[PDB]
Ligand binder design. Sequence first.
Ligand SMILES: NC(=O)C1=CN([C@@H]2O[C@H](COP(=O)(O)OP(=O)(O)OC[C@H]3O[C@@H](n4cnc5c(N)ncnc54)[C@H](OP(=O)(O)O)[C@@H]3O)[C@@H](O)[C@H]2O)C=CC1
Ligand SMILES: NC(=O)C1=CN([C@@H]2O[C@H](COP(=O)(O)OP(=O)(O)OC[C@H]3O[C@@H](n4cnc5c(N)ncnc54)[C@H](OP(=O)(O)O)[C@@H]3O)[C@@H](O)[C@H]2O)C=CC1
Lengths: 327, 327
Amino acid sequence: MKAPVRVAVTGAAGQIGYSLLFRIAAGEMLGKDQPVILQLLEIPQAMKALEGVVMELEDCAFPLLAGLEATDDPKVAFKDADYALLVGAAPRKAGMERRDLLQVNGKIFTEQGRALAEVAKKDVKVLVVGNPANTNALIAYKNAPGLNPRNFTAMTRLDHNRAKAQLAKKTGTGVDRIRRMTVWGNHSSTMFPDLFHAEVDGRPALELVDMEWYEKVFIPTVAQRGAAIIQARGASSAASAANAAIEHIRDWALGTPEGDWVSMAVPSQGEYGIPEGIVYSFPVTAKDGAYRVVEGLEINEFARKRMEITAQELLDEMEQVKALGLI
Amino acid sequence: MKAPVRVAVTGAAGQIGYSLLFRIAAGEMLGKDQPVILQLLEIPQAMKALEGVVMELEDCAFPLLAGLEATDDPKVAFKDADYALLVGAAPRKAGMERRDLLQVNGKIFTEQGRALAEVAKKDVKVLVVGNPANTNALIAYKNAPGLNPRNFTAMTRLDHNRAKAQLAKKTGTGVDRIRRMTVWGNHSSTMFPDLFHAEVDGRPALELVDMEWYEKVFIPTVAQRGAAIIQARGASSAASAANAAIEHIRDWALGTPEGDWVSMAVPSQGEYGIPEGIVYSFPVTAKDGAYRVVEGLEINEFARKRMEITAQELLDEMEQVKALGLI
Ligand SMILES: NC(=O)C1=CN([C@@H]2O[C@H](COP(=O)(O)OP(=O)(O)OC[C@H]3O[C@@H](n4cnc5c(N)ncnc54)[C@H](OP(=O)(O)O)[C@@H]3O)[C@@H](O)[C@H]2O)C=CC1
Ligand SMILES: NC(=O)C1=CN([C@@H]2O[C@H](COP(=O)(O)OP(=O)(O)OC[C@H]3O[C@@H](n4cnc5c(N)ncnc54)[C@H](OP(=O)(O)O)[C@@H]3O)[C@@H](O)[C@H]2O)C=CC1
């Protein structure tokens, strides 16, 4: 058995946490032979509920759960953390506007970024799920001087998975036969699901589906999927989002399949002309903790335009945050 | 390489289902080498919500999910089923007496038992989670002509795991080092957690903990655990219950560890003098998809008394459903 790794998870008493923690403790994120120590964080008002989650975790009698600790102190939750999943974010209460939301998120991620830089492992892998994910990750790494900025990522894997699901459904093929899907940019509605390099059973996706469907059906449907789940279930897609978070960390820590790639929002270094610094989703391959953007892909006008649009939205968000003195 | 197996799950749009289905699709219940076809059942009023669950499952892009179908017809959900998890049960309505709850469940499980006997695989493995689990399982198998009564079981694995967790905590040992825990009888408050044969790192449990703690702390705590979760979280322990359901089916199908055993409520054949027919939790081992009660265990007066009390409660429940003409 490998030495235990410490996995910090914030917003632990929430919906995503409830669908995330058990699978992590079961070994679904880092391997069935990798013991994990869960270090859970919540706000003071949710600590009672978190104790309940702690009890449920204990009641699963997980052989890989080497340790379990709940706290409301980021410096305790992130202490010696190998992984940190930042799920908690500013909730939209009545009266609050975007700018107000950014203020609160600014405080949350500046504090957590500083806490991570102060007490976590130097190579701690960070995934931001709390929205707005890309910008929150930016706030976090900018306030985490002393930590590799590339270790601060944002989640787009749910959109990535939803895109694969839609393509599989349309072509009548198993989702396991869909490869090289790419979601570029922001986690938002400007998110761009790329089918130009995707393959279905080895065949180019655009040889099986046409541009009309791609533009008028595929894109809108992937973008509205979250809302579709809420309209049907009456609750947010916590389980599939948790699954995506697990895969995001898993494929990064372990590795992506040969000849395939995944989507991850990471600090740009200028790849594909994307402004440097902003956290942007790119097609990436990964191996044992290290990822690399798949550069060199041919980009047509349809993709370029959409990649530019989402890049601009991220730039504007960055400027808004900069104007607030958060970075 | 292995052909897909069909897994039917009722009450699929509920809380337990939400914590259960994703892990089944991920291969956590029947093996990472075993494709599964999920056949989900709900009542008509919950079909829209079930559609939402279906969408979330699709959005996980599970390579092992070979099929996914939602229906409100038991004869469709159970068609050629290899496994059936009966989670849906009568809701606790206001001004609704216990007996009234039994009548509603009588209709539900009489119909499902009949459906299973008509369209499922003859060797379908059934687990009843919906409460009252033991009695609902009794109603189901007694209404499943042509099917093996021993293939109808009820869940006590959550109580079993909770007992292991409490023992681990008290002795300061990893839960992975706790073996031979037993929970006897009904899924209810009369459930009897047995430490007389349990071992901690190979050492008898009662050599590490005293009888006073066992009687006045351990037993009540295991019995009140569900309520503890609710008081802390404000919601039932769906995640850990789902985990227990998964382990119940998993160990039954894949087998129990050498030198260890688990708890399963199964139709009694007179083991330990327990009246025949009632679905009673016994310590059991499993191999090649079949289980066998662990007989030969020494039963002192303390245990005998408690085993008798819970057996009597099950007999009383049996009498009540018989009086309602359900069996
Ligand atoms: N530990 C800490 O520092 C903090 C903890 N919290 C805690 O975090 C918890 C938030 O829980 P709850 O309200 O249930 O939220 P959820 O678990 O449902 O959501 C948490 C975050 O994930 C985002 N998200 C992204 N994709 C999805 C998706 N598909 N489904 C659901 N959420 C998604 C949400 O954005 P969106 O709003 O758009 O859904 C939100 O920012 C609370 O328990 C709160 O007390 C809050 C702040 C700081
Ligand atoms: N498909 C069908 O034939 C039917 C489907 N249903 C559907 O079943 C679903 C019930 O969902 P919901 O109300 O969310 O219920 P839950 O998923 O929380 O509970 C379902 C069953 O599990 C039992 N249970 C046992 N242990 C636990 C535990 N630790 N935590 C929670 N439940 C536990 C419950 O008993 P307890 O009540 O004591 O918690 C209940 O009978 C509804 O969606 C309903 O529409 C209903 C009837 C028939």
